[PDB]
XYZ file of N, CA, C and O in Angstrom:
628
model
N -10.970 -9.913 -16.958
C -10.462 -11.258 -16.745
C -9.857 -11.361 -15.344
O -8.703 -10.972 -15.161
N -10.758 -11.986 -14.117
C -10.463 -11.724 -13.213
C -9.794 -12.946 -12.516
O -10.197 -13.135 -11.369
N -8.702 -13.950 -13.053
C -8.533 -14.804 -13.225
C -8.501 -15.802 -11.665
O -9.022 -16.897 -11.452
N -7.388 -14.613 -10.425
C -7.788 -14.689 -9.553
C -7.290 -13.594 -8.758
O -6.164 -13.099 -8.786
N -8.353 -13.259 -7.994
C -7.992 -11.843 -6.830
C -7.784 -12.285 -5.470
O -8.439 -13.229 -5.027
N -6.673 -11.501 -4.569
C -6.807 -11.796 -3.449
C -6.994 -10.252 -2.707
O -8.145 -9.836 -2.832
N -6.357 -9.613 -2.190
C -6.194 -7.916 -1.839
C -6.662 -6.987 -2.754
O -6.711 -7.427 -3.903
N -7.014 -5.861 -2.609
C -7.100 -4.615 -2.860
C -6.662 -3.602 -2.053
O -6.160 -3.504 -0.933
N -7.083 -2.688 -3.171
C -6.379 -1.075 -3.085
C -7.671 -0.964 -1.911
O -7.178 -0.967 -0.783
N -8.887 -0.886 -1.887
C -9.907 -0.643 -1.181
C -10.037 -1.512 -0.073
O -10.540 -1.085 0.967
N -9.647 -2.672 -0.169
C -9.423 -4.004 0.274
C -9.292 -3.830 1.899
O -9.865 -4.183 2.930
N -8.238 -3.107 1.489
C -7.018 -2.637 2.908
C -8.075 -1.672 3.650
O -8.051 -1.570 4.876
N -9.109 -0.889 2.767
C -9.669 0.334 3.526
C -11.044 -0.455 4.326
O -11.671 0.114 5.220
N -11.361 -1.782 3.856
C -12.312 -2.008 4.386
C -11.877 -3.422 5.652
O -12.793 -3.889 6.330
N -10.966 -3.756 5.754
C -10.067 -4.015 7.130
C -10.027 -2.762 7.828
O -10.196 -2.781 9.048
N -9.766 -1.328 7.044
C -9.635 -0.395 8.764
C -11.014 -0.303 8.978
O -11.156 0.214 10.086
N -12.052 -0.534 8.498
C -13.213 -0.074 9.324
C -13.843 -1.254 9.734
O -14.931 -1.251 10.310
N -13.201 -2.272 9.461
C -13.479 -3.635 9.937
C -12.838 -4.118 11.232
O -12.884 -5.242 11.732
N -12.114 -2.808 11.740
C -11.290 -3.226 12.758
C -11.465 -2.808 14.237
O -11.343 -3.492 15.254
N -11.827 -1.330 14.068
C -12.556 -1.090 15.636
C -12.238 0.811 15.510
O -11.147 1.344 15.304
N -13.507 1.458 15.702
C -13.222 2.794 15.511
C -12.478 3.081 16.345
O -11.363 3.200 15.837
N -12.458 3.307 17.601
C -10.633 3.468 18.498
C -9.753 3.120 17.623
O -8.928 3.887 17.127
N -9.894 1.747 17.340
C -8.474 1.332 16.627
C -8.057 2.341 15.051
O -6.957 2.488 14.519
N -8.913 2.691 14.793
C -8.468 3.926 13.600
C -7.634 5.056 14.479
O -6.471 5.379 14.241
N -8.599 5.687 15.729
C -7.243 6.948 16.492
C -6.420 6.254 16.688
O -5.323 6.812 16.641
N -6.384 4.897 16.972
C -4.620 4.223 17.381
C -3.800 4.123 16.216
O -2.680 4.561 16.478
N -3.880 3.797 15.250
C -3.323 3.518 14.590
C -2.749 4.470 13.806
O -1.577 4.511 13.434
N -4.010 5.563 13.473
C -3.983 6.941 12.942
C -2.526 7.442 14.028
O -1.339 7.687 13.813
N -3.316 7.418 15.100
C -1.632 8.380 15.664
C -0.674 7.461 16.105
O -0.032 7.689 17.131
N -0.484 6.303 15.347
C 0.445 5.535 15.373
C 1.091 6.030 13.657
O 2.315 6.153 13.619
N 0.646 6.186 12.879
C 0.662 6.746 11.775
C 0.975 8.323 11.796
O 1.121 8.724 10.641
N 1.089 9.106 12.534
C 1.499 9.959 12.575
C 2.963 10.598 12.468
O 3.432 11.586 11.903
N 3.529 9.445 13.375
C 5.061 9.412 12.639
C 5.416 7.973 11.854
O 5.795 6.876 12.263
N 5.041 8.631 10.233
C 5.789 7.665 9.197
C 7.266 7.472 9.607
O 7.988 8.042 10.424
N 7.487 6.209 8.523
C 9.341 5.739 8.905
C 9.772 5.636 7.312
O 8.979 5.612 6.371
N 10.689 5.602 7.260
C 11.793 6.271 6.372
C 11.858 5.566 5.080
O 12.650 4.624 5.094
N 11.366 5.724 4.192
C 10.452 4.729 2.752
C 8.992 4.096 3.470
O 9.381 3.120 2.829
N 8.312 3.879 3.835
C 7.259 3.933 4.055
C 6.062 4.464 2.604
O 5.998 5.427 1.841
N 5.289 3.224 2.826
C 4.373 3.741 1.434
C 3.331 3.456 1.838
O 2.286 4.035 1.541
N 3.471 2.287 2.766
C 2.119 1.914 2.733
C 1.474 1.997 4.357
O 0.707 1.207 4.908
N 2.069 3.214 4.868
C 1.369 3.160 6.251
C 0.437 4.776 6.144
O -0.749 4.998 6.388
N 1.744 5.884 5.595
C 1.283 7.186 5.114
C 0.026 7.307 4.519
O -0.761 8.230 4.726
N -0.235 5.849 3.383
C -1.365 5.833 2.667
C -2.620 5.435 3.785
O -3.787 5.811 3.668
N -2.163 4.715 4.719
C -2.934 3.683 5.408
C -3.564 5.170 6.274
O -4.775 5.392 6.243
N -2.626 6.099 7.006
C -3.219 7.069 7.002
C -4.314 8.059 7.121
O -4.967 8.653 7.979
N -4.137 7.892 5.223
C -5.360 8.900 4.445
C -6.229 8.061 4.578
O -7.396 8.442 4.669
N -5.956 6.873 4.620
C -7.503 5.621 4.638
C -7.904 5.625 5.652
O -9.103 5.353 5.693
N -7.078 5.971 7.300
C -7.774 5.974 8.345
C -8.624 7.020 8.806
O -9.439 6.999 9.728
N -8.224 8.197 7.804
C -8.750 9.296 8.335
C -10.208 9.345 7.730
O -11.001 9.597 8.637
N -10.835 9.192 6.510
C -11.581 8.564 6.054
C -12.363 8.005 7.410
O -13.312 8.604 7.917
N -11.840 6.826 7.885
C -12.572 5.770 8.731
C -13.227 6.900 9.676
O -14.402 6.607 9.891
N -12.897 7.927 10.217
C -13.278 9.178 10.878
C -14.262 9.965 10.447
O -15.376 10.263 10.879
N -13.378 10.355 9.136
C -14.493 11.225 8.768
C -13.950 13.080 8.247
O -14.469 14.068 7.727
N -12.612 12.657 8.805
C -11.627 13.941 8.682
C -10.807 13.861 7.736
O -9.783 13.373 8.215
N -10.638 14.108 6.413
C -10.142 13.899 5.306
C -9.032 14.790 4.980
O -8.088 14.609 4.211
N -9.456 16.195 6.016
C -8.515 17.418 5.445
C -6.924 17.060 5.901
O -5.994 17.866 5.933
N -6.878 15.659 6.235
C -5.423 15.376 7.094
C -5.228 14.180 5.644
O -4.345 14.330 4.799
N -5.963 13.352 5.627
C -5.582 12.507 4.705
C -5.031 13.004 3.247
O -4.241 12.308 2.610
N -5.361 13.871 2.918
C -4.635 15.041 1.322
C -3.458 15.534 1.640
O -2.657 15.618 0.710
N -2.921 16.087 3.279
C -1.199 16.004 4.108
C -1.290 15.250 3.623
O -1.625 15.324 2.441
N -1.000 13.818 4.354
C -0.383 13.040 4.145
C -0.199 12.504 2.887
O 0.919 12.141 2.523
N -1.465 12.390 1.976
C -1.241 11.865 0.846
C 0.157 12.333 0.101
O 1.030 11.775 -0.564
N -0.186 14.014 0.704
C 0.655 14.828 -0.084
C 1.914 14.671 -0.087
O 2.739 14.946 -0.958
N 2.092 13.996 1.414
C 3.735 13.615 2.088
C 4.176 12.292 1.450
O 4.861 11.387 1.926
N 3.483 12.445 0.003
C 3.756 11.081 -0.652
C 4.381 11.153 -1.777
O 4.199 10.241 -2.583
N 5.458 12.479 -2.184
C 5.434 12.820 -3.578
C 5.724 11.555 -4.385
O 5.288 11.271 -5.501
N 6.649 10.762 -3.505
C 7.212 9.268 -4.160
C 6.564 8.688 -4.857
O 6.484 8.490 -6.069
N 5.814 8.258 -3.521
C 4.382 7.439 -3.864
C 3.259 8.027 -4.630
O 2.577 8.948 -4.180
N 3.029 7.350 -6.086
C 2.372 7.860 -6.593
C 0.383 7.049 -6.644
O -0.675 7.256 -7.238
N 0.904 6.183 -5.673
C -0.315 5.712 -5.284
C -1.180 6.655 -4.037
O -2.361 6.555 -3.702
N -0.418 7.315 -3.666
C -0.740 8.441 -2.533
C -1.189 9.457 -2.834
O -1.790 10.127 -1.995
N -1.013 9.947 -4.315
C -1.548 11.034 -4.723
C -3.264 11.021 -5.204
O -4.288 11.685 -5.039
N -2.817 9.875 -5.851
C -4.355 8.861 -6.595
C -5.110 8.646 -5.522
O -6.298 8.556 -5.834
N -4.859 8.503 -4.148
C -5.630 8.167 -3.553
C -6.188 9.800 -2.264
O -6.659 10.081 -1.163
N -5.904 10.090 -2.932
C -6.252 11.557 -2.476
C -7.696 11.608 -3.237
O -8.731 11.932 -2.655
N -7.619 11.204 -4.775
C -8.803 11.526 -5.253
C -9.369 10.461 -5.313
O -10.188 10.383 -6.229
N -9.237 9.478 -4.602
C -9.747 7.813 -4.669
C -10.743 8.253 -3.824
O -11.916 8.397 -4.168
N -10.117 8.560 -2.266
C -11.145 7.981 -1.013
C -11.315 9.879 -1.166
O -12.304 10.473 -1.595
N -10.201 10.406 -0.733
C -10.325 12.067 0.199
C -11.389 12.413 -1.263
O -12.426 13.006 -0.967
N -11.233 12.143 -2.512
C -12.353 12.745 -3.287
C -11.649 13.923 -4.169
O -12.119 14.312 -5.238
N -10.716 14.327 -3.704
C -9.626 15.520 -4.283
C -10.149 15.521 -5.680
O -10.471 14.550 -6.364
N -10.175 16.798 -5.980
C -10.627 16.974 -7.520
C -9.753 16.848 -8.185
O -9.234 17.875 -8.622
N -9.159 15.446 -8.589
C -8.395 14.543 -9.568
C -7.416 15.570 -9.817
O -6.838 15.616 -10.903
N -7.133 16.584 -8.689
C -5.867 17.578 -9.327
C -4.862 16.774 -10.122
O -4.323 17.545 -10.915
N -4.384 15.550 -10.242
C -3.360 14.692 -10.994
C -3.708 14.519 -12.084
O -4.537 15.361 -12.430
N -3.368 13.506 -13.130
C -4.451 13.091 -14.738
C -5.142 11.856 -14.131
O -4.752 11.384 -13.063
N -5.894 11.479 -14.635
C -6.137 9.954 -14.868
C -5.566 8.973 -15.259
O -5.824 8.774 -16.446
N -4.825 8.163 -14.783
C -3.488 7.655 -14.985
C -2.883 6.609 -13.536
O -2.457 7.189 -12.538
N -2.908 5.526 -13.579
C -3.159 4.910 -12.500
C -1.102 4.848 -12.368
O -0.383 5.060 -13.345
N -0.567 4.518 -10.961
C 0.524 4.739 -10.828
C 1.077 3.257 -10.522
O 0.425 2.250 -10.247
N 2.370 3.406 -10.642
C 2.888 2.209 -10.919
C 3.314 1.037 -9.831
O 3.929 -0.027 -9.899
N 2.256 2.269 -8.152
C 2.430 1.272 -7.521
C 1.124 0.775 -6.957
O 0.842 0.501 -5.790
N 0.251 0.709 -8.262
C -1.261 0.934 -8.492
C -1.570 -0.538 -7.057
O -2.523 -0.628 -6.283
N -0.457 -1.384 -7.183
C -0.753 -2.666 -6.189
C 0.288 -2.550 -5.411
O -0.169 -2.366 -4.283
N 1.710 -2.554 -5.360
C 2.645 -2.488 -5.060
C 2.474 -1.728 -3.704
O 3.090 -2.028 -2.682
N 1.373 -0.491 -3.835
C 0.973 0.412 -2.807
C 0.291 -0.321 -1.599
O 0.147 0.177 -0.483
N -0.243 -1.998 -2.109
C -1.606 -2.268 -1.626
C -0.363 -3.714 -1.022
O -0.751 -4.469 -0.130
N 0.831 -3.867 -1.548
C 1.668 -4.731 -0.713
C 2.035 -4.280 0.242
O 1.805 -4.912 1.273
N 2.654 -3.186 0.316
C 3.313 -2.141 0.986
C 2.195 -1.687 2.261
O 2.713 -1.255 3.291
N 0.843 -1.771 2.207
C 0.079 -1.128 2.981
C -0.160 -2.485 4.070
O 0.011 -2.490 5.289
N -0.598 -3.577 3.208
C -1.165 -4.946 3.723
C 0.273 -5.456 5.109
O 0.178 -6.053 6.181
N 1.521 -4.826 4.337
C 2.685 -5.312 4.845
C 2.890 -4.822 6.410
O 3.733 -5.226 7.212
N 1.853 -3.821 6.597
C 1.701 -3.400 7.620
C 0.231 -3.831 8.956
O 0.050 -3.759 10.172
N -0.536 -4.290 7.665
C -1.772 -4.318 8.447
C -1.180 -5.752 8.901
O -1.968 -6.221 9.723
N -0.225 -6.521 8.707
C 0.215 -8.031 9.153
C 0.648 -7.682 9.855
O 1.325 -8.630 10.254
N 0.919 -6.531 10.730
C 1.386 -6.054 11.740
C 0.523 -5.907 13.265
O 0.858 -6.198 14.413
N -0.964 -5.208 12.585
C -1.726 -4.921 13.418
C -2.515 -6.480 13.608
O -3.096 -6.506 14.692
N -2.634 -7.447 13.021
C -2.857 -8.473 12.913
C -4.438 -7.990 12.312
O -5.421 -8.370 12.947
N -4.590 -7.289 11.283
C -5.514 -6.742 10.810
C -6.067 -7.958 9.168
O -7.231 -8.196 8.846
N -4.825 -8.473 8.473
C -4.910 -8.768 7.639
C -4.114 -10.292 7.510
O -4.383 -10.693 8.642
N -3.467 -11.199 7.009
C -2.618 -12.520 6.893
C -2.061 -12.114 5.911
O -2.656 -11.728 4.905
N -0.581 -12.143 6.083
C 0.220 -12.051 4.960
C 0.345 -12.204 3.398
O 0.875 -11.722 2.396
N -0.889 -13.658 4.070
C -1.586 -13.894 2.394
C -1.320 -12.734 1.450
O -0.651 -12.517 0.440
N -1.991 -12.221 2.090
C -2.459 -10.948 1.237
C -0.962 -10.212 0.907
O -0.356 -10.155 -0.163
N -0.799 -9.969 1.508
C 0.856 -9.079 1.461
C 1.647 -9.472 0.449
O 2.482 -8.715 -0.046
N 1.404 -11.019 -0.054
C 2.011 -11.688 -0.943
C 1.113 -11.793 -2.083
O 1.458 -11.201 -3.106
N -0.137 -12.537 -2.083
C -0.908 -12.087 -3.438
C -0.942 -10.482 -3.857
O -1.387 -10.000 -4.898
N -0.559 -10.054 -3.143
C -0.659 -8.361 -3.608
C 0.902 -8.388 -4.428
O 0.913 -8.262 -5.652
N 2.072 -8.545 -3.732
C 2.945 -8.131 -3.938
C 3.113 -9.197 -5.516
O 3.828 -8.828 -6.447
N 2.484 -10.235 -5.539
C 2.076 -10.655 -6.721
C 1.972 -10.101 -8.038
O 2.689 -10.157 -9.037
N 0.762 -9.490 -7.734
C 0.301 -8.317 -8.532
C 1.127 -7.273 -8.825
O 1.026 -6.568 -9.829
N 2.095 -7.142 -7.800
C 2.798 -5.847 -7.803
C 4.306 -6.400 -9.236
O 4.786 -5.717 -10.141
N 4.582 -7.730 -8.859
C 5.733 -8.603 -9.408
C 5.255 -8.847 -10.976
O 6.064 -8.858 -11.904
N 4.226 -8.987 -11.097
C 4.027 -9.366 -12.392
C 3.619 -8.296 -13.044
O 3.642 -8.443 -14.266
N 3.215 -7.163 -12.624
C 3.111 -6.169 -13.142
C 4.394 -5.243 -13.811
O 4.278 -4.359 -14.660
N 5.443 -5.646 -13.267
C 6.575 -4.886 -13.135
C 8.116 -5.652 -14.084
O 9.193 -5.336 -14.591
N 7.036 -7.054 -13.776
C 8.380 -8.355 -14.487
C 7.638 -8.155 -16.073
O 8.311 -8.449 -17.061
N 6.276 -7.662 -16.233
C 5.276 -7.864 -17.298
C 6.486 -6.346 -18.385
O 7.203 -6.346 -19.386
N 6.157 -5.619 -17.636
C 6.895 -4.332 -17.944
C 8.103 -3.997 -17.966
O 8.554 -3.073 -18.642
N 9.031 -5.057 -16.882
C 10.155 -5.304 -16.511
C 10.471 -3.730 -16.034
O 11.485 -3.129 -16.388
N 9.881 -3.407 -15.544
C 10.190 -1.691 -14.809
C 11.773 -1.612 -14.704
O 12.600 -2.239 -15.366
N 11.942 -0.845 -13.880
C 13.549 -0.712 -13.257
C 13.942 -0.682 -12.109
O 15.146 -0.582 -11.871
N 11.651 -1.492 -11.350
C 11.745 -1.720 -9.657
C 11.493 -3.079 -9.664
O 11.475 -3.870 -8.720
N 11.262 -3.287 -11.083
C 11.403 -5.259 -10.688
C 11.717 -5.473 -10.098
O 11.202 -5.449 -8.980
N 13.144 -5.972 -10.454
C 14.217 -6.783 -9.502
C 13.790 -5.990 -7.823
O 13.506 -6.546 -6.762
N 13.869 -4.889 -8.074
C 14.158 -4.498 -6.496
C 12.873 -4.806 -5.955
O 12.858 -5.049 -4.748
N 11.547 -4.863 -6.715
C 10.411 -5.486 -5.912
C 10.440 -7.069 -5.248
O 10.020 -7.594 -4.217
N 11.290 -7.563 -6.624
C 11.777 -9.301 -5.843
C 12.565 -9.457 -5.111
O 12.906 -10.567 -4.703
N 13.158 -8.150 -4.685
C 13.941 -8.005 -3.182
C 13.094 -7.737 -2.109
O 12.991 -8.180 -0.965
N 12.551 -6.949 -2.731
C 11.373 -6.242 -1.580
C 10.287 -6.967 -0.809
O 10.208 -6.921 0.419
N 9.640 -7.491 -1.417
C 8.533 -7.976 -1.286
C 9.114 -9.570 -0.490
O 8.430 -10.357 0.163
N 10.425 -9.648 -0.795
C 11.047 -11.134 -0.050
C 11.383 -10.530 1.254
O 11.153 -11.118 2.311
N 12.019 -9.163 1.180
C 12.722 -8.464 2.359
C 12.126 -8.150 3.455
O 12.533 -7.909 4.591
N 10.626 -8.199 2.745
C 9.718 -8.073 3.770
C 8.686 -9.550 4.068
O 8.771 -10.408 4.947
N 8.193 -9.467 3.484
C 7.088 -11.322 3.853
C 8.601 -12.078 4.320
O 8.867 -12.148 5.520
N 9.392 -12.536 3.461
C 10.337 -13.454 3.356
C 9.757 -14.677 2.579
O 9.028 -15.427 3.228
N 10.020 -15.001 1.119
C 9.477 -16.170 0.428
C 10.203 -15.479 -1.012
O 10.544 -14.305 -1.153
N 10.301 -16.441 -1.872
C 11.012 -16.270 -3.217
C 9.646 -16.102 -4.116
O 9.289 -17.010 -4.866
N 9.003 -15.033 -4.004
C 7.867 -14.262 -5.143
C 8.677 -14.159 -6.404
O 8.149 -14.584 -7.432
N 9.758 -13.707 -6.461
C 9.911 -13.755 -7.857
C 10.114 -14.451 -8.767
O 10.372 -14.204 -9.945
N 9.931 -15.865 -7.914
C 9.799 -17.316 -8.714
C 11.129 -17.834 -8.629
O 11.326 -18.784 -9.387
N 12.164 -17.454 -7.875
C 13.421 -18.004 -7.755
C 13.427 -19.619 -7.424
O 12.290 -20.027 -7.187
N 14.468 -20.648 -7.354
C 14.381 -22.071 -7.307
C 14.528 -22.073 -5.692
O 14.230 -23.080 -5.049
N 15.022 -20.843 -5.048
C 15.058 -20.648 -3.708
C 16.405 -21.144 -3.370
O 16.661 -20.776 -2.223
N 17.181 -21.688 -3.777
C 18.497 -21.651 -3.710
C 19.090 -20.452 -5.150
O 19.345 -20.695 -6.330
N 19.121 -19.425 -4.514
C 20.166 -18.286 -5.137
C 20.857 -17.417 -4.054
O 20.472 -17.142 -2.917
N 22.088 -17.030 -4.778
C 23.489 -16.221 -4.292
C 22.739 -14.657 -4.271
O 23.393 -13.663 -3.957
């Protein structure tokens, strides 16, 4: 029931090769030094390395993801990693793909759109479940785009 899609997990991987093979070494070693919670650049990464062709760097980094459990998954997503993890999709199965997009609005790779229908996905997934990163995703995801995703009246304390 695909009611409506905007971003993907793959989504994001086919903007980096949509973007300019130089621009993968730039970005790649712009990616080289992650910043401090970072989820979705580390991942962006393993996806650039991919765009190369050199994977044995993208499974580092993935690896430099213990947090992120979308980083591990995606070790055996793109790098191919023999599913050393279970099968078991992680809880920032989109959240990963806000977090990544949140960056490519950086490189002017992607429109925020996306950053927000993702983080969408990421909100209702989490308000569905009511996780215990809800709330902090309807911080997050505002802290970063800036817009009331979590459906607030937009006047709140």
């Amino acid at each position: 029931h695909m009611a409506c899609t905007g971003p993907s997990l793959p989504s994001a991987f086919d903007i980096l090769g949509a973007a300019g093979q130089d621009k993968l070494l730039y970005l790649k070693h712009k990616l080289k030094t992650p910043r401090p919670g970072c989820q979705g650049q580390d991942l962006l990464h393993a996806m650039v390395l991919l765009k190369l062709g050199q994977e044995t760097e993208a499974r580092i980094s993935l690896e430099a993801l213990k947090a992120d459990a979308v980083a591990r998954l995606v070790a055996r997503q793109w790098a191919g990693v023999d599913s050393t993890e279970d099968p078991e999709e992680p809880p920032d199965v989109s959240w990963a793909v806000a977090r990544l997009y949140h960056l490519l609005a950086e490189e002017k790779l992607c429109p925020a759109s996306l950053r927000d229908v993702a983080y969408q996905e990421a909100v209702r997934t989490l308000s569905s479940r009511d996780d215990h990163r809800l709330g902090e995703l309807q911080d997050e995801a505002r802290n970063r785009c800036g817009w009331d995703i979590a459906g607030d009246p937009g006047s709140i304390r």
